[PDB]
Design a protein around this ligand. Structure first.
Ligand SMILES: O=c1ccn([C@@H]2O[C@H](COP(=O)(O)O)[C@@H](O)[C@H]2O)c(=O)[nH]1
Ligand SMILES: O=c1ccn([C@@H]2O[C@H](COP(=O)(O)O)[C@@H](O)[C@H]2O)c(=O)[nH]1
Lengths: 215, 215, 215, 215
């Protein structure tokens, strides 16, 4: 499933991120806001049960109980994903966190990359309950989707109940590459951009998340 | 405009609020959450506009710029409305705040009328820029709407650009009264409950907002 | 006892609060900050006990457990105290909040006020456990000490283990008045201004708190 | 300069971290917390000046202005430091963040050398202004100081007006290895532990910050 959250407020933030005149302080600020928001959207796609509670006025009433909110694991890719994950964690107060330090080897070429090398420098993940936990992986950008598929190689084994991928911008090439391999993955993103340049950068994109966040 | 925000997450928190076994800490904690979510939703009804921004990759693209995020005044009626206004202020960083104290007229009798006058003992409100500001009045529960009415008479004279009313549970009698008298108002709420018992409590409701929050 | 918290950072904030040019968004922004830092300072004055915990390395070591952090009740006198309490609760996660819509009566100015009338509109407070709970009462200003003494009147009969008063600015008259009656109160403030005018406003002080925060 | 910040509130937080039973969510929560506190203490050593501000009462008064609050760069060396930096960044709203990913050297032999090389694979740091910016480098635990030394050797090259190192626990060894090479570095820690066991673990320490925060 592909959820493109393009509501006025998320598109308003995306425009601040895209704008090159935005400094890293405000850039990181929005990522935290968007992870907050995107987290809410994801909340509304979870499994809920119909329950009954008694109000103060003795009256019994029917309400919902999203049992899944107690089975969430958010994996942080680090780098630009930190402000984002900081936002998601705000929305899922009961989520455990894991980190899979992934970074693609940025190559310069004469053609548009359809694939890139990805190295993993750090790995600390919580136990993932099979058929129970909902895993959320954050990545500000998805270009060739090489970074994402690399982290997935492992997450997918755990066989979590669900798998969500949050990103700000995704390239058409990337969404299709990921969802054609794991179409069961709920992929959230505020927008999808057309192409990748010869360095594997999304166009129009927003630049190098890492550079925008800590430059 | 009536906007009932009955999504899985909001109703989940609402269930939490109704449940009589939810202590005051968690009760307020959830009230803050809803202010955030209810604020997010309010944002998407805001008046935006299309702009053009240049990204780091030299490409220029179109985006959104919700300028009304600068012209916002949130009015806090105190009491249990505090945790709520707190979350709404987090959803509107550039929003100014005003507060008002109010006590409805105490007329001899154990029973309670539905149309009572209200005494506004304290009133501190930022200047409401005519035709430019968007006023948001926060109030946990609208049972009889006597207070909402008293306040609205004041805000109206200011000639806002838009007026919003946020609440968790709002009695059917209340919605009707407010919207029928002021049709142009955006009244957001997580749920509209049926009746009001003689004591004026919303049924099933969630008890006394104030006592749940600071009891 | 009197605790004047004049650490470089607190005085920095205060300078912002006193500055008549500080707008209400920043005014309240600073009050939340100051509430955090003061709750921190306050937390250090609390009673604690030596314990023993087991590190993952299978090694016991002595430690500190501030047991009272689970027995705190913050009393919000509302209005301009709001932002300040918002900050204090951030330092005390497990604290129960109570509210008191108290407000001294504006005087004529024909005589130097000593004992002012205090109206009590609303009052919802948690069960204060005698000899166990530590009560924290917050009000940004303390001039004639009337609003506070009014509040204390009740808090004392509850026989708490400790009573803490927190503010930004206190007057000499007020600190002595409160402390002459209840010498056991732990009174925190960032500054003690020397005089009150005839209207009951601290000089140089910082103006009317409510108007600064909600004007 | 060595600053051991062992106040009741910080030791209380430290005690929880050392306690093996503290779950991951709570472990990271405390890091964020110690981060704002340590941030508060650091803020009192920053350059500041006396200024004249006029209050609403129409009278001028002196105050403090910590101008150095606009010249802070925080360096996130990732890993278990994410929670800590998060807190630090709250204490310094105007701080710019930079990141540098570092990994230890593969060294066959169960035992871990006191001194060892460190590979820095990612480095994105804002423009450190010479003799102006204050560089804060958070790192939960300094055992062998190997990572800190590697990172310092880079940071120092920019001639920062000042360099701070914030850590929860630090071994005597590491403290001596840092200050012995750079005695001008402000090394803030909550507790210094005696020895390091053969696996590079501080004793009593608190185990592996990575597994404690992400496991
Ligand atoms: O325009 C771009 C393209 C890629 N990336 C980085 O590349 C990673 C994903 O690229 P890919 O693996 O999908 O190609 C992310 O961690 C992100 O930091 C950017 O910052 N900006
Ligand atoms: O300079 C002053 C003096 C008093 N007050 C208000 O008066 C109350 C305390 O005054 P008193 O009861 O200590 O005299 C506080 O709620 C505060 O809002 C101010 O705002 N500014």
């Amino acid at each position: 499933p592909l959820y493109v959250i393009d509501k006025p407020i998320t598109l308003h933030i995306l425009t601040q991120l895209r704008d090159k005149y935005t400094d890293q302080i405000n850039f990181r600020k929005n990522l935290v806001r968007l992870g907050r928001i995107l987290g809410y959207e994801i909340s509304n796609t979870l499994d809920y049960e119909i329950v009954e509670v008694e109000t103060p006025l003795g009256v019994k009433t029917k309400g919902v109980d999203i049992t899944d909110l107690n089975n969430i694991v958010i994996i942080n890719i680090l780098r630009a994903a930190v402000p984002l994950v900081e936002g998601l964690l705000k929305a899922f107060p009961k989520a455990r966190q894991g980190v899979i330090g992934a970074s693609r080897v940025e190559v310069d070429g004469k053609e548009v990359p359809k694939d890139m090398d990805v190295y993993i420098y750090y790995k600390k993940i919580p136990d993932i309950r099979a058929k129970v936990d909902n895993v959320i992986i954050a990545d500000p950008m998805i270009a060739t989707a090489s970074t994402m598929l690399k982290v997935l190689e492992e997450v997918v084994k755990a066989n979590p109940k669900r798998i969500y991928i949050v990103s700000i911008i995704s390239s058409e090439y990337g969404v299709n590459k990921i969802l054609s391999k794991y179409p069961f993955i709920y992929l959230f993103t505020v927008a999808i951009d057309p192409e990748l340049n010869n360095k594997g950068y999304i166009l129009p994109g927003l630049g190098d998340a890492g550079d925008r966040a800590f430059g």
